């Protein structure tokens, strides 16, 4: 909120634009990495209602419909253990926690019901 300061700053050059471009590239590559890590299959798989997985009990890593969020018990434990000023703007990520949980559940259901064939093809 100054006038003469901006007039004296505009004479330095393209430092403003360079820093803005660097921060924008960082913000874009963050979402790029988030998509490259989780979003690997373009098909959201769902586990069947029967939990007869050969004796194994995947009732602590799969989503629970009774909870308001679609995260599992371990995911809730992980989220619980971790807790617009003058020129500071925090941009929200593209893929929210709900979409990340959906991708994780899809990968888990694929690994359970298809082994490794869901990655190489159908």
């Amino acid at each position: 909120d100054s006038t003469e300061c901006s007039n004296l700053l505009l004479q330095y050059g393209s430092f403003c634009t360079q820093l803005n471009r660097a921060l924008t590239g960082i913000a874009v590559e963050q979402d790029k990495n988030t998509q490259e890590v989780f979003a690997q299959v373009k098909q959201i798989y769902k586990t069947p209602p029967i939990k007869d997985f050969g004796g194994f009990n995947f009732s602590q890593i799969l989503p629970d419909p009774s909870k308001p969020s679609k995260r599992s018990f371990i995911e809730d434990l992980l989220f619980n253990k971790v807790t617009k000023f003058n020129g500071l703007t925090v941009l929200p990520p593209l893929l929210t926690d709900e979409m990340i949980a959906q991708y994780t559940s899809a990968l888990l259901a694929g690994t359970i019901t298809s082994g490794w064939t869901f990655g190489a093809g159908a």
């Binding site: 909120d1 803005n20 941009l91 929200p92 990520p93 929210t96």
Partner: protein, 366 residues
């Protein structure tokens, strides 16, 4: 977007063209109450006044001199200042002010000025060349005069040498006119230099009594004790305005706060040393100062070869502070896109799980 990308063929995507910021609307300035102005309410209209050779020197204590009540008062005869403008008196501070009040004849008022010389201005009271202050005189013939002439107003007339500025004489020895040493009695070469003027209610201009005061403005290595009356405007509850709470400065939107301060704390700061809460000095209420809405203006638009309709996104800005459907998202206010309840593949990433696309009668959807 065309000027930012420096081209005429804008491709499909979201581009950050410019930035948005809510400009302030007012410049409110507040200060505590102005109570206990100064002893000027009684030092000017007092009953008795000292003589010209024994003028009093009342030191002004810690009080804000209200010069507006004196300059705008038409009851006074003359109002002149030296070294400082009368209008800027209420906007400055001083360390010590001495008010010298006395009774002088109407014709001798002209000689009471810096740089003057004569009989009264050199043997009773003298002002320096660099005197900085004001002079105030007013007519008092309606109450200081009496039938038959008054003789209680003594004055010194003859002296052996000139007096220094801001000097008061106490000794009242007789004046020596000749070379013969005076033995304390009058004679051909020894006369009493102290006399008394006569003020009558039937005397015209030049013989009427005029009460003149001398205000001395001096500053040295000491904290200021007398300043001007600081004004206070009316505050606004919720509006992006400029604030000045007793020397502070900034721009933000105020709001009712719940932080219970301490009786001696004035303004609060959060982590990283930033002022986030101040106290109104008048009503003694606590109100936070959040920064005004600001963000980036992103223009969501498809390829130029497809269409020219665009969509504006204000990142981190509420839709109420923006001022053709207006839809509010968790990433910012989006103007120019129709929000649908269906789900499609993300074409133009916006943020917070929302994307835009140019589909179906035909407009940008979110």
């Amino acid at each position: 977007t065309k000027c930012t990308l420096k081209s005429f063929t804008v491709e499909k995507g979201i581009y950050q063209t410019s930035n948005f910021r809510v400009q302030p609307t007012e410049s409110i300035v507040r200060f505590p109450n102005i109570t206990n102005l100064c002893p000027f309410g009684e030092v000017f209209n007092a009953t008795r006044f000292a003589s010209v050779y024994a003028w009093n020197r009342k030191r002004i204590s810690n009080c804000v001199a209200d010069y507006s009540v004196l300059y705008n008062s038409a009851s006074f005869s003359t109002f002149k200042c030296y070294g400082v403008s009368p209008t800027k008196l209420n906007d400055l501070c001083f360390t010590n002010v001495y008010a010298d009040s006395f009774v002088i004849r109407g014709d001798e008022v002209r000689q009471i000025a810096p740089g003057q010389t004569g009989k009264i201005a050199d043997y009773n009271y003298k002002l320096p060349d660099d005197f900085t202050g004001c002079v105030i005189a007013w007519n008092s013939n309606n109450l200081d005069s009496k039938v038959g002439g008054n003789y209680n107003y003594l004055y010194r007339l003859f002296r052996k040498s000139n007096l220094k500025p801001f000097e008061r004489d106490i000794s009242t020895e007789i004046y020596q006119a000749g070379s013969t040493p005076c033995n304390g009695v009058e004679g051909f070469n020894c006369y009493f230099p102290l006399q008394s003027y006569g003020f009558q209610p039937t005397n015209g201009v030049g013989y009427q009594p005029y009460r003149v005061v001398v205000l001395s403005f001096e500053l040295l290595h000491a904290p200021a004790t007398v300043c001007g009356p600081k004004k206070s405007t009316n505050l606004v509850k919720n509006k992006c305005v400029n604030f000045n709470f007793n020397g502070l400065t900034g721009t933000g939107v105020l709001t009712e706060s719940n932080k219970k301060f301490l009786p001696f704390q004035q303004f609060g700061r959060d982590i990283a040393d930033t002022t986030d809460a101040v106290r109104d000095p008048q009503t003694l209420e606590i109100l936070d100062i959040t920064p005004c809405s600001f963000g980036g203006v992103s223009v969501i638009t498809p390829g130029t070869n497809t269409s020219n309709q665009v969509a504006v996104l204000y990142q981190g800005v509420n839709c109420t502070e923006v001022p053709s459907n207006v839809f509010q998202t968790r990433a910012g206010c989006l103007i120019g896109a129709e929000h649908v309840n269906n789900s499609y593949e993300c074409d133009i990433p916006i943020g917070a799980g929302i994307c835009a696309s140019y589909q179906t009668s035909q407009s940008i959807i979110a």
